[PDB]
Design a protein around this nucleic acid. Structure first.
Ligand SMILES: [Mg+2]
Ligand SMILES: [Mg+2]
Ligand SMILES: [Mg+2]
Ligand SMILES: [Mg+2]
Ligand SMILES: [Mg+2]
Ligand SMILES: [Mg+2]
Ligand SMILES: [Mg+2]
Ligand SMILES: [Mg+2]
Ligand SMILES: [Mg+2]
Ligand SMILES: [Mg+2]
Ligand SMILES: [Mg+2]
Ligand SMILES: [Mg+2]
Ligand SMILES: [Mg+2]
Ligand SMILES: [Mg+2]
Ligand SMILES: [Mg+2]
Ligand SMILES: [Mg+2]
Ligand SMILES: [Mg+2]
Ligand SMILES: [Mg+2]
Ligand SMILES: [Mg+2]
Ligand SMILES: [Mg+2]
Ligand SMILES: [Mg+2]
Ligand SMILES: [Mg+2]
Ligand SMILES: [Mg+2]
Ligand SMILES: [Mg+2]
Ligand SMILES: [Mg+2]
Ligand SMILES: [Mg+2]
Ligand SMILES: [Mg+2]
Ligand SMILES: [Mg+2]
Ligand SMILES: [Mg+2]
Ligand SMILES: [Mg+2]
Ligand SMILES: [Mg+2]
Ligand SMILES: [Mg+2]
Ligand SMILES: [Mg+2]
Ligand SMILES: [Mg+2]
Ligand SMILES: [Mg+2]
Ligand SMILES: [Mg+2]
Ligand SMILES: [Mg+2]
Ligand SMILES: [Mg+2]
Ligand SMILES: [Mg+2]
Ligand SMILES: [Mg+2]
Ligand SMILES: [Mg+2]
Ligand SMILES: [Mg+2]
Ligand SMILES: [Mg+2]
Ligand SMILES: [Mg+2]
Ligand SMILES: [Mg+2]
Ligand SMILES: [Mg+2]
Ligand SMILES: [Mg+2]
Ligand SMILES: [Mg+2]
Ligand SMILES: [Mg+2]
Ligand SMILES: [Mg+2]
Ligand SMILES: [Mg+2]
Ligand SMILES: [Mg+2]
Ligand SMILES: [Mg+2]
Ligand SMILES: [Mg+2]
Ligand SMILES: [Mg+2]
Ligand SMILES: [Mg+2]
Ligand SMILES: [Mg+2]
Ligand SMILES: [Mg+2]
Ligand SMILES: [Mg+2]
Ligand SMILES: [Mg+2]
Ligand SMILES: [Mg+2]
Ligand SMILES: [Mg+2]
Ligand SMILES: [Mg+2]
Lengths: 213, 122, 112, 54, 116
RNA sequence: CAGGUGGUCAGGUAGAGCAUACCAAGGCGUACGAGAUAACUAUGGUUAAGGAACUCGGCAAAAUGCCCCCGUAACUUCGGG
RNA sequence: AAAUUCCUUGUCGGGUAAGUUCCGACCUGCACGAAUGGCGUAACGACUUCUCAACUGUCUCAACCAUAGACUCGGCGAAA
RNA sequence: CUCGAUGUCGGCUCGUCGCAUCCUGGGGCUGGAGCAGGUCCCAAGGGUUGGGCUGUUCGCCCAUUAAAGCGGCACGCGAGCUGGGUUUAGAACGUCGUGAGACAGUUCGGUCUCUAUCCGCCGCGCGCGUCAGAAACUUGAGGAAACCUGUCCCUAGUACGAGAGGACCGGGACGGACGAACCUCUGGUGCACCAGUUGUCCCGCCAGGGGCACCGCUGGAUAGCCACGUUCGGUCAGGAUAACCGCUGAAAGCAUCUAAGCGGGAAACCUUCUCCAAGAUCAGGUUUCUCACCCACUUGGUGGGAUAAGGCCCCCCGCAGAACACGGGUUCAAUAGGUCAGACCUGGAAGCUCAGUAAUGGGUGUAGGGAACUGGUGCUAACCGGCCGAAAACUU
């Protein structure tokens, strides 16, 4: 009751619909997937399904990971993730060895696209958090982009935890909710997803079906 | 895009030649005014002997903008000046006729009378 | 070639003439006024191309009633009925933004 | 800012023992009938007569 | 070529045009130049594009080399000896071998040389 | 040791000029280097639309700039402005 | 109502969409005044104060780029 | 308490908390017809605008808004910034004093020092632990983030009302503000891109180019980074409740929401959605791989040596990056460079020829030059290799 697929962001183009409006889409190669494992509550305590994606040469996969595919009877893929289901109904429509292509989604379905955001490096506080900074003139001495104050005074004699300071920004799991599927393309294994998708062009992307719609 | 302290040429014959923005009506702390947005303005320059005088607080709708506007089909419109029409409180122009071209964004903001008086709606 | 040329390929259009920056162009644009679907003519000077295939735009500039207007349509857009070249131009730039500060006799383009 | 107090013996040695040289790894090279040891990044230059073994 | 992602060689970016041109005059005159390792990674896609003008060898390719190299005696050996030497090789005209780092600043050194 | 020190000589092209620009004769590359796209600070550069709304205050920046030719107000001690 | 006015943002006119500052008067001068000069005054001011045109990262609201440091490696190596 | 120093008002930047609630949410009474109100009770989840004048705080005013809350934290915050006011030395006016001078009376002028040792906070590694050595995918104890709201239409000119006016509850569309990811468009930037052009020197000279003048200036500009641009979010449904409205019903033959027992009930609380997370020392789970030797001794859960699975270092690099880490690749190779062809940016090269007295113009030719994005190509460098790394048992 919650379909999912793994894929690769291929970039953004634009396309038009029947009302002659322009729709900025993000082309995702929702490629062919294969199951390799089924999590059951009597064995594992939860209910999920694995999914394997990506063409890899069979010499680049080491011997512990290879034998996990030999028990499933599947040639080794590159990526391997899980699709979290609810407390039932996993082994009623998924079998070990099944082929999940891109047409499990319809047109006009709403999806949740999660991924990994682009890296921004060690970033300051006017970029990581939107601090305003000080002025650029009127006497301001070397504090144009600095945070300013960070606490009170002798009560309390500390900085509170979670105080927004500089640091590294990005490379986080980011889920974008309720994006519209414009056109499924089973000929090429390509979903045209309306809007923006987290990641760099080439990164892994999990496309699940939305629940908020 | 027009905010507070912007100056706009006036695109009708009420007597005013240049108004200055005060608020952008539409909500708390709304920052910009595109085409079809209502401006409370003061009148900074006028023609001698006209209907309105210098220093009057008017309402006005923006009809021309130098900054581009993304229409919902991918096309844009761009003008060489910022223009407005001083309006009555029932969305009717105070003057009798409108100078220069206007934008077609005035159609879905129910400004039917400014469209019929404009020389060219784009 | 690009990676996404199997997605833009069915959306491309033929019967679009070969116009350069500096030409004079009619653009027939479909306009909905209620439920009427009329067709409005835009005659001006093409000043710009920003290429890419399905993502390519052009920009026309006319002088309407003492006030200059620029439109920036996409090429291969379905709200354009047809484009008709009126006059070829003899320019030296590719962006022609110097016409944003000229009026009258001085905003004229030659005839080849 | 200035240091408030002097650091104890246990706190100066814990930091100072981390200023340590990281050693390189040597590999075996036989040129001109003599065996030597160079790092692996200079493996090609040992075989072309560009490394002076002193 | 692919520009420098980061600070330029020798300080300014008007100085990197002079460093990469002087190293090319010396690489084409002697055939083997010892220098620092970052200044030789940066010479390899810059010198191999001057040999490609020598493999073509028209007047328009010789005027293009004279934009960068100021020394006419090494332009002659580029268009009469080096260029026709590489007529049957599809790129990769140079080679970087790594030398021992130099004393005094531990600057990692490397040689850059033509293939034969 | 980025500060201070009196006089003398003083080239070419552009230029009103001993300003400034690029050069001659003649000097020098001046004494830690080599790398690397972090924040942040300095020193510079550009900026859509708006144009003092910033601010104690147009502070800082931006703007004006040269030669020839027309033209030029109140006020005034008749010179000026 | 002042480089002088405490009460005080006095009151009235002007300027501004809005003016404790500014210009004009009024006189209820806490506490003006004739060489410790009184009242004016063209020119002049790196002086104080207010308005306006032109212009701009001063700001709405920030973005990016080069360089010197910061950061890494090798040498020398302090200080409160 | 501090005089062998605890820096003062306001503003900027960044905050956190209380509720004595300004808005939004739930209610009782009303001298509540309706619409708007008054008063009291519950409620802190989020939100609470920009300007004029003043050093100001405060306050008046302008234009809005769902509303423009009140307070604590050294009247939060100067080893974070400002220095206009107060509160040094200069000077002046008024007033006081014979004078020197003085004035919560005024007025112009007036240096804001510090390389972070410790805890604290924000990030990132190294070490060991988790009873063999490894690799992959994981459950979630417990936390972080987020939480705002308007206008118009329908129901309906209906209920209500003499009229004027004008709804509750339900259904829909379109916005403001704020956060996130993103680069297709719009826009910004562009220091090895293309073109025009001034001064000057140089390449022997002409023709063609370069060095330097802020990237000399100027017109453009792909990639990256970006916002002014794009798309999306704060939803729906449960649980236990606050004020308050009840049902059944005694003590008290009646009555009462309560003493036994059971309900309805809010942006607060808990689940649901997003993220972190087994150093959760109770150190988890499901799996696959290796699953094996040798020597010395005081024979010990003993020291060394050599391996397996697997990893690290070196090497070629990255849109990953301060260093480290992380990710891809290593000839069974397209990992970077070159090279070939596209895309894209610039806009018509040089040479030759024709037209003109010449400056310049036409032709050969969507020319030439060129970086990031895409695909072929085994030409250069990813090598002729070093360092780590696997098990006492016993009880039921
Ligand atoms: Mg980066
Ligand atoms: Mg700022
Ligand atoms: Mg300083
Ligand atoms: Mg500064
Ligand atoms: Mg402090
Ligand atoms: Mg193009
Ligand atoms: Mg760059
Ligand atoms: Mg340096
Ligand atoms: Mg230069
Ligand atoms: Mg000296
Ligand atoms: Mg001279
Ligand atoms: Mg000079
Ligand atoms: Mg010079
Ligand atoms: Mg010296
Ligand atoms: Mg930098
Ligand atoms: Mg600007
Ligand atoms: Mg502009
Ligand atoms: Mg202006
Ligand atoms: Mg002004
Ligand atoms: Mg102001
Ligand atoms: Mg501010
Ligand atoms: Mg202000
Ligand atoms: Mg100034
Ligand atoms: Mg300036
Ligand atoms: Mg004057
Ligand atoms: Mg007064
Ligand atoms: Mg006065
Ligand atoms: Mg007298
Ligand atoms: Mg006297
Ligand atoms: Mg006097
Ligand atoms: Mg003087
Ligand atoms: Mg060092
Ligand atoms: Mg003390
Ligand atoms: Mg009430
Ligand atoms: Mg309460
Ligand atoms: Mg609050
Ligand atoms: Mg809550
Ligand atoms: Mg507070
Ligand atoms: Mg306070
Ligand atoms: Mg304080
Ligand atoms: Mg302060
Ligand atoms: Mg004094
Ligand atoms: Mg006296
Ligand atoms: Mg003062
Ligand atoms: Mg100073
Ligand atoms: Mg510091
Ligand atoms: Mg939990
Ligand atoms: Mg804990
Ligand atoms: Mg962001
Ligand atoms: Mg792009
Ligand atoms: Mg653009
Ligand atoms: Mg060039
Ligand atoms: Mg010449
Ligand atoms: Mg020179
Ligand atoms: Mg771009
Ligand atoms: Mg509820
Ligand atoms: Mg997780
Ligand atoms: Mg474990
Ligand atoms: Mg690796
Ligand atoms: Mg030609
Ligand atoms: Mg001739
Ligand atoms: Mg010619
Ligand atoms: Mg190419």
């Amino acid at each position: 009751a919650r379909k999912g697929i793994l894929g690769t962001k291929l970039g953004m183009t634009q396309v038009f619909d029947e009302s002659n409006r322009v729709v900025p889409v993000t082309v995702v190669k929702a490629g062919p997937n294969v199951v390799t494992r089924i999590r059951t509550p009597e064995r594992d305590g939860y209910s999920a399904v694995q999914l394997a994606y990506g063409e890899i040469s069979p010499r680049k996969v080491n011997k512990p990971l290879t034998g996990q595919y030999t028990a499933a009877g599947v040639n080794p893929r590159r990526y391997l993730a899980e699709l979290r289901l609810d407390d039932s109904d996993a082994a009623t429509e998924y079998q070990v060895g099944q082929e999940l292509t891109a047409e499990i989604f319809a047109d006009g379905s709403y999806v949740d696209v999660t991924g990994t955001s682009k890296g921004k490096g060690f970033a300051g506080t006017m970029k990581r958090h939107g601090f305003r900074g000080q002025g650029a003139s009127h006497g301001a001495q070397a504090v144009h982009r600095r945070p300013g104050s960070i606490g009170g005074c002798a009560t309390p004699a500390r900085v509170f935890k979670g105080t927004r300071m500089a640091g590294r920004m990005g490379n986080d799991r980011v889920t974008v909710l309720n994006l519209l599927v414009h056109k499924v393309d089973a000929e090429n294994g390509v979903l045209l997803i309306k809007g923006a998708v987290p990641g760099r062009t080439g990164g892994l992307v999990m496309v699940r079906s939305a629940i908020k719609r | 895009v027009i905010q507070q302290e912007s100056r706009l040429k006036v695109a009708d014959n009420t007597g005013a030649k240049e108004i200055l923005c005060i608020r952008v009506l539409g909500g708390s702390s709304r920052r910009y005014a595109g085409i079809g947005d209502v401006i409370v303005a003061t009148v900074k320059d006028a023609i001698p002997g006209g209907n309105v005088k210098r220093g009057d607080v008017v309402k006005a709708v923006v009809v021309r903008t130098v900054k581009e506007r993304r229409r919902p089909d991918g096309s844009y419109i761009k003008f060489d000046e910022n223009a407005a029409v001083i309006i009555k409180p029932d969305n009717d122009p105070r003057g009798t006729r409108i100078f220069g071209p206007v934008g077609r964004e005035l159609r879905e903001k129910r400004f039917m009378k400014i469209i019929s008086l404009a020389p060219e709606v784009l | 070639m690009n990676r996404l040329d199997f997605v833009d390929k069915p959306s491309l259009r033929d019967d679009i003439p070969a116009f350069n920056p500096g030409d004079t162009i009619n653009v027939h644009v479909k306009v909905i006024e209620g439920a009427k679907e009329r067709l409005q003519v835009f005659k001006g000077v093409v000043i710009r191309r920003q290429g890419g295939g399905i993502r390519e735009t052009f920009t026309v500039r006319k002088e309407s009633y003492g006030v200059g207007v620029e439109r920036t349509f996409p090429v291969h857009s379905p709200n354009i009925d047809h484009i008709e070249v009126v006059t070829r131009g003899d320019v030296r730039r590719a962006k022609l933004y110097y016409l944003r500060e000229l009026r009258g006799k001085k905003a004229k383009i030659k005839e080849k | 800012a200035v240091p408030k107090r002097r650091k104890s013996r246990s706190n100066t040695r814990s930091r100072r023992s981390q200023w340590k040289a990281a050693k390189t790894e040597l590999v075996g090279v036989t040129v001109a009938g003599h065996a030597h040891k160079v790092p692996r990044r200079l493996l090609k230059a040992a075989r072309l007569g560009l490394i002076d073994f002193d | 070529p692919k520009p420098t992602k980061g600070p330029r060689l020798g300080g300014s970016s008007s100085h990197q045009k002079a460093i990469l041109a002087n190293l090319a005059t010396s690489l084409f005159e002697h055939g083997r130049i010892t220098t620092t390792e970052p200044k030789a990674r940066a010479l390899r896609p810059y010198a191999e594009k001057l040999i490609t003008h020598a493999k073509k060898g028209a007047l328009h390719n010789r005027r293009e080399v004279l934009k960068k190299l100021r020394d006419k005696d090494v332009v002659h050996t580029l268009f009469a000896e080096i260029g026709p030497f590489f007529a049957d090789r599809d790129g990769g005209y140079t080679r970087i071998i790594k030398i021992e780092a130099r004393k005094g600043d531990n600057a990692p050194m490397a040689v850059i040389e033509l293939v034969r």
